[PDB]
Amino acid sequence: KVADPIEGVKATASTDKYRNYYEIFVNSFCDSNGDETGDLQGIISQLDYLNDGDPNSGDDLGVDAIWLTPIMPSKSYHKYDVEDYYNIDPDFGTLDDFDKLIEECHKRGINVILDLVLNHASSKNPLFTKAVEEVADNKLDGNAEYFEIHKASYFDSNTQTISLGNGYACEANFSQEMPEWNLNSKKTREEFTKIAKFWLDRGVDGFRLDACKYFTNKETDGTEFLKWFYDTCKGIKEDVYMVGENWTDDSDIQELYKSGIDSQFAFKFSTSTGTIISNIISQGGMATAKKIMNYDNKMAESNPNAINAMFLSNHDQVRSGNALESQGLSSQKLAAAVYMLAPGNPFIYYGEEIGIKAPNTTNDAAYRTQMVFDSENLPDIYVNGIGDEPDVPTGGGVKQQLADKDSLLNYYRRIITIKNQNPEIARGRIVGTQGFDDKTVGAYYVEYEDSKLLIIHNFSKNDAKELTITDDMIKNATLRADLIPESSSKHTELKDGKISVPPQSTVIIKSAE
Template identity: 80%
Template sequence: MKKLISLLLCATLVGGCVLTGCNSQESSGSSKAENAAVADPIENIKATASDDKYRNYYEIFVNSFCDSNEDAVGDLQGIISQLDYLNDGDPNSGDDLGIDGIWLTPIMPSKSYHKYDVEDYYDIDPDFGTLEDFDKLIEECDKRGIKVIIDLVLNHISSNNPLYTKAVEEVSEGKLDGNAEYFEIHKSDYFDSGTPTNSLSNGYECEANFSHEMPEWNLNSEKTREEFKKIAKFWLDRGVGGFRLDACKYYTNKSTDGTEFLKWFYDTCKEIKPDVYMVGENWTDDSDIQELYKSGIDSQFAFKFAQSSGLFVENIVTQNGVAAVKKVMNYDKKMKESNENEINALFLSNHDQVRIANTLEAQGLGYEKLAASLYMLFPGNPFIYYGEEIGIKAPNTTSDSAYRTAMIFDTDNMPSIFVNGVGDEFDEPTGGGVKQQLADKDSLLNYYRRIIKIKNQNPELARGTITGMQSFDDKNVGAFYTEYEGSKLLVIHNFSAKESKSIEITDDMIKNAVVRADLVAESSDKHVELKDGKLTLPAQSTVILKSAE
């Protein structure tokens, strides 16, 4: 309370402004009062590193992140060289992005550039490095408090994988009780007419929903499950924190209950590593996602909110904060009905989608900043797609490879990474690369850094439960409560692109409320003030309120 009174007195001294900023032309006689008035609410709050499953994840498409040996391909040593950018090991240093979780897209041997058709589940693709390089990556991440999860492809396999080539050979010999049992190999009339398959010998086919190069595992087979247990143990024993499971949507088919299979796999992994974290890719409707949550899996990506056609962009462009908050709250509530321990996994775009900057940059930097604070401040684990934090755009919107271009650390020293189908020429982000944006206090990158710092200072944001919305009779203003271990925060977003909002805060909302944190899109020098129960929130900005301690 004393802190609040002090802030209010300081605000009075500068003429009652509710959104304040330093002015270098002011006389020195008023400088002390102004400095107090513009005090950053997060400056003296200690951030705490995560020691549980709640993390700020960063998706790295390994081919495109950082090339350590100048062969035009990103690699594991390249990632190691940039770890201090992601996390320097000190949550209070303020010198890094603050990432404490990394998702690596497939790293196992494959002839494709994307590596989702795995030829060997027990090794590293030579383009990316060696198992020794991987061990070093895990070691360095552990030093910094970063958990690494790897993409694990259990729905399909490479047609060049020896297990599959042996199965094809055995089927031609009429042998069906060997390697054929690993895969969805059946007589032709077993499959529905629209099911993609590979034709084999003697009237047999193998299901292949993605391509002929990706035949599908038989998830019911005891042989398959024994192999998967070995694969999981191999990587968990090597230090990974868990798995991103590709294509969970296809786990269920004519003969497989996907929920039963996923429960088996999740439980199997927990026996190996009790705190294993698992997130599934399931781009389908809510009812199917709810069903798969019954397996106990920690997270599934919330696709409906992501990409240019998703609900976040829709609500940001239409400036409807109430709708955005309500939709996330209702979605999270539904998923928790199936799994009370569900950790929502929100994101803006990923390696299969047009980058979010392609949609929002033309609207203005404030739109990109609002999108970041929106999805990252809901409870759960947000997933940042590499380069999103500096506004990288795809060179075109028609091919997956265009969404996977090189990370840009310095626009004065552009990378020479080659990306299949796109080449090695990329547009510079409007705000520059990492180096340039670190030097710009109002850059998108520094906004992301501030968001993550605020999250590390306030465990209620990631770990809390959304207990309700707060209405301010204004569709632009979306607000919700999150509670964790008896502590409650009120998160308020102003979706208006131009208008500042004057909001009344009462003790019925938050008793003896103080500004715990703010994110002002216009300028990092400006901060939100709560005075006499009145809060003024600038356009496209966010404030977090808490009871005075």
């Protein structure tokens, strides 16, 4: 039997901005009080699954940052329509519950960012209802100055608006319940400063910025607004971290990075139509390595400190398992390795690590089904328009997958441990690809502080590849890690400069020390 190369390699917990993030759709995660709605104490009850605080022992997932979807008061189950920016929705808990969450996450080395919704407010937010009332009395110099309120003629036939009195209306791209803020208003920028300070004063590590695409409009430069907001928050907390949801083309993502924001989600590489899943299906390894290098480096031109944010799917998209599980469990495992071993901060969507699927593609709520911690004791959370009992994931719930050495979950755990053993992976830049005369093999060099690693993926579903590593590639090369999905007891070795890379497997080569 070939020895596991990561045995007796010490792992280290992150203490900086580089993290394996976990996105929690709060209503669907964990109910702690029987009302069929997930809540903050439910999250607290599962923190030892997410990270037990020891990267060298235990059976936790090992994620070291959480992004909570909106948690502030709102009449909806998703809460992107924010009615109060200074409290917790009562169904999720109180500010005391929130403070205990921060405390217990930080004890385990888990950072926390909040979903911050700056493009729009709820139509029932009192700041807005006051504006509606003033505008109906033809008063425009009061609360109307917070919002994107103009005469109706100002708006284009295709821009959704909320009709107000005296011939006015408010921009509202997403919904009649989501009137948009005027991001150039001095009053609005003072208010956003107060909101940010309120949450940063509670130990929040940063924000996920909703709907960044809609920051830009006819009179607003989204990059100027975001630079203003990011710089303001950095004055409050120098090491603040933000990731922007900028659901747009590569050129506009590159442009918004001039704001200085740490990260934007890499939509190009996500979903069944995106680069990673498409190329796993096509066995296009070389193409993938090229695209990851070129994208990460291009974004770093606009922000040299860019932290890319790769992901397979999020709460707005069909679950990645709906495309990958039918291709085989080893394809799901390879997909995890590919997106999580790219530079930056990958985002795991809750339940992805146990293969939750979406029951349909016609209701957003199908992307937000109930988390399954134990398939023998299913949860009871009501999911809008779907129901209150989940399907059993193909591999079982968390408990079952931890016990199966060949599970999807344990492959995610091993990827995280490998990253905790090799800080260059997340923190470096790709300085080149490595060809192995084979379109099926994708390989690249990631380098951080003059330490260079060679990451090699074999995208073949059925064929192993015998590769030769030379001193010109990696001097005094050794096998640093392997990820071999067909069996958790199968490992490889670098012997006489040759290494066999099994199907859909990943190896990491490093110089001897």
